[model samples]
Target: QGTILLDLAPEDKEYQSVEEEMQSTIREHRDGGNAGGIFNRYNVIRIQKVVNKKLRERFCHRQKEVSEENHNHHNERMLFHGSPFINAIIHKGFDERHAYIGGMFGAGIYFAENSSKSNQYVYGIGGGTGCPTHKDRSCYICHRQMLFCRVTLGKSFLQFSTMKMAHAPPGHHSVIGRPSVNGLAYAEYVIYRGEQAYPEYLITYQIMKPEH
Candidate 1:
């Protein structure tokens, strides 16, 4: 887990380039470029930090309002940020082709179905909101909306597929429940756990590709 965190930590150079690209693309498209093309490109680079700032601030204020209204969990602090799991996937491998990503946050056990199983599947346990909100309280997952979540194996391969929030399995919760408000995102990939009768499936997994 720590290794994944390190790998996904955004570098100053890369962050700057992404910011520049976003501004440049936005300007080009707004001026006269293809709206569809610009929209697609803009969406591609809209990372959590870049897009959810307002939402997070609003959530903070909402928390304060609720505190004033009720007086419970007022002492409780909530920090909003994007999902690290998705970031890990992106840091490991994410690109334009595959763009399905989702995640929820909360304390839960990550069970390895079978201890004897060499390739154990990791899954979350609990609930909250996923991503792409509907009406403030409504979550895309709860609404049964189809969304893509990417996964990266180790290196070399990536996969993408639509994930049903209901299919979150035994574990998983609404993203809103996460300790932090960071929405998870990912690049597409696939995983192959050596289980026959009940093969563990992740819409996406991690795989390394050649640097050059």
Candidate 2:
């Protein structure tokens, strides 16, 4: 029902590093946390698919804005960043969208690549992304559970497959709409197409939500 809590209350522990500080600003942003400084809509997403060493290293440092790209179905100016809105019916929330599968703002679990540009993507709300189960099969139960572990959510493990993609080439997959799990949610995805959607591999992650 909830996420893991280190119980690291703000009052007790002090966030010092620039990264930690920015993370705090994001959490409190909804409540005017950014009233004083670092006030821009920001979120987090964790990529699990291990690829390039440099790309993986860059993930250690979080950052981005406007950039040019030249990948399949990729376009400039029409980009989405930061965390998904708290809740929106029409526009849709960022739990798991069309481009991505399970995993919250921090632990999102979807990658777009049959080969060429290999990469990964995940959602990491506030900070409490549960333990990832790392499976390529779809969930017959809680497809919309949004968590990584199938045990906590649905009947089958989360499936971040491209085989179901109609637009994908033979032995390849993309532009898919899989439905047979507990529920349906878009997968927040990211890739390492080198300026084709990111300067390199831009994965905007959202720290877990407050442990209130």
Candidate 3:
């Protein structure tokens, strides 16, 4: 019921004085000290802008490097299918009444060794099938400058358009152990077994990097 009088003892005052002296901007030399309310945090738009700029710079630098790398690869000896490359013959057996659009609606990679406009062979070697006209010998198709878009089986492929796409005159073809990417190396062929002769077409494969 009466007023409580709590006076600080001298020892307690001394402790309080020392505590005030010790209370600095951090507790153990590694963090914050003024942490009761409304403290500071990193909230700068300037730094945010810098981060964005850095990303753009990095991307541009990468693009520049990639461009240089491609330029270098151009001069080096490439090991994959390149320039005047030949495609192997794949076959598709179908009669003329079947609405085939390219390669004369033919079989076994039909090619004319005289027209550049055939075989999508337009990018560089845009002329003729690069095959020859010899009796009883097979010919190769020129697959020059084409990208082999890898295909995983079992999806609708002809869901598009084209005349025969790549130039490969896929009847007979090959190379040495470390063979070459140019010229007619070696070639051979026998038509597909169930294949009936068409007066106008051969249902066949894309003759890539062929030879004879």
Candidate 4:
């Protein structure tokens, strides 16, 4: 079914803090190029999705299993994943099939600790790119919707080299794609299952370089 989208008041402290935090991360990770710049936040929508029993059950089981092994209860991480199909994701959750194939980590839903890293995927209409889940060409204003998601990285496997994985290796529930000596300037966290992530917030923003 449909998910509830709660628009946070622009004057709320949480709203301002979230915007500042995201802007800082993007600024820190951005390569000094015109590809990315300081982003002005438009709005933040809190996504409260309809509960899926299957996803909850599986996620809880995985959390328990990982907690037992690592002594780290609920090893969850908040990360970023930018997409044009904001409506679809809020309604149906993340789908690995919709993810771009041939990524360094293979065909899976990818997350980024750095907002700038995820910002690379934010696209507008007619870039030869189309949203698979929705009819819309872009989420908002040519492209701005970026999701802040809660990901379950239980017993994640780390990889520093290029490895096209269909899923996590044995005994691992996720993949932590770290920086390689040759490439991969930043880290990427990927989960193979759609239920492994819960989209928490949809942030709308506009990228702009700071005035000299």
Candidate 5:
């Protein structure tokens, strides 16, 4: 089995639910901060990758072993990841090498709990050309994509300060960034292991011009 992509219709129950959640996530974030834009959803793609599934399940099994060793806090959540190389990510899974380097917490793959935060990393149409863009990647007008992934956070380490770390500190499986701390405006989850996340949804949307 390889990577499978399923394009969901707007009327689909799962599509509708995810669409609503994306909007609500943005709305909730805007309540405390100043950010506004309309998300014109284009497609809701369900990503089913065999490699990612195996790795994700393996990670879960590892967590089970540590359950008896310590706290089995496998806080799994569906989070958002906006990237210019969205297509490559779907096939290869989360790779730190392809991630934005030298972030607040180092070169780990970053995921946001809210859509607004992830939106910052999203690029319009042909934006991927700036980096490792594919020849097939092109679009008209301004269309962007966001990847919603299921991340496994096992024994997360709460980070209040910046650390140029290569991996989660010691036994910690992941990093949970605090908002309003160390110059962060939104909460970000960082995972050093690529297997800790599975690309589940590919949300294509257009950004509407904001009102003045």
Candidate 6:
């Protein structure tokens, strides 16, 4: 959330000396400064080491877990009970006839990317949720499967947009007006109706940016 500024200049004598003294104290504590203080000192060292290790591992493992959890939660939240059509739509990307088809797909991809990036922020920098999932049960993103999926989605979206633009009428804008079919709206509909739908389904919708 914030940046940490550290002084590395040798000429910053006062702060350097203080830092050196602290390091010496820690070293002394490690070498048995006092039996009474040893436990506390060791605990401090242990915790610091564990925390550092966790931080390093955050990008590799913790981030993946958060991504998977968010995706699953979004899916669960959008589920609708006793709705075969909604389920089918979710499993398959929305059709062109659907309003907001582009927007739906964009939202799905945006959410997925945000989910992954959020985990990186939390684990890599915020130092939150160090606990890792089991090896077998770990989310596919943690194992790079999700990363691959994201990449594929990104390229696919780009290509699809390009093709759509290329095929448009001479006077027509490449990106049309915002369509009524949005993924979140559909998700809301399914959720409201209590249906179980595939979370990864892409919707066909358009978004109206300021440029549009």
Q: Compared with the true structure, what per-residue lDDT tens digits does model 3 show for residues 144-192?
A: 2221111111111121212232222232111111112442221111111
Span of ten consecutive residues with least summed lDDT in model 6: 42-51
lDDT of 6 by residue, 53-104 (tens): 2223322343344335445222222111111122233333222233222332
Name the runs in model 5 displaced over 4 angstroms.
27-70, 124-140
Off by over 4 Å in 2: 1-167, 170-174, 177-184, 188-196, 200-212
Better model by lDDT: candidate 1 vs candidate 6: 1
How many steric overlaps does candidate 1 have? 44
Query: CA lDDT of 68 in candidate 4?
Result: 75
Stretches of model 3 off by over 4 angstroms after superposition: 1-103, 119-212
Give the Å shift of residue 160 in candidate 1.
23
Please give the clash total of every predicted structure, in order: 44, 38, 30, 0, 0, 18
lDDT of 1 at 156: 20
Best by TM-score: 4
For candidate 5, lDDT tens digit of each residue in 71-154?
756667889887667778777767767655567777788898887677656653223332224322222235567878888777
lDDT against true structure, model 4: 0.67
Query: Which 10-residue window in model 4 sums to the lowest lDDT?
Result: 124-133
Against the true structure, candidate 2 has what lDDT? 0.24
Task: Score each candidate by Cα lDDT.
Answer: 0.23, 0.24, 0.22, 0.67, 0.65, 0.22
**Per-residue C-alpha lDDT of model 1 across residues 69-123, encoded as one tens digit per residue:** 4443333311111122433332332222232223221122111111111011111
For all predicted structures, in order, the TM-scores are 0.18, 0.21, 0.14, 0.76, 0.74, 0.15
Ranking by lDDT: 4, 5, 2, 1, 6, 3
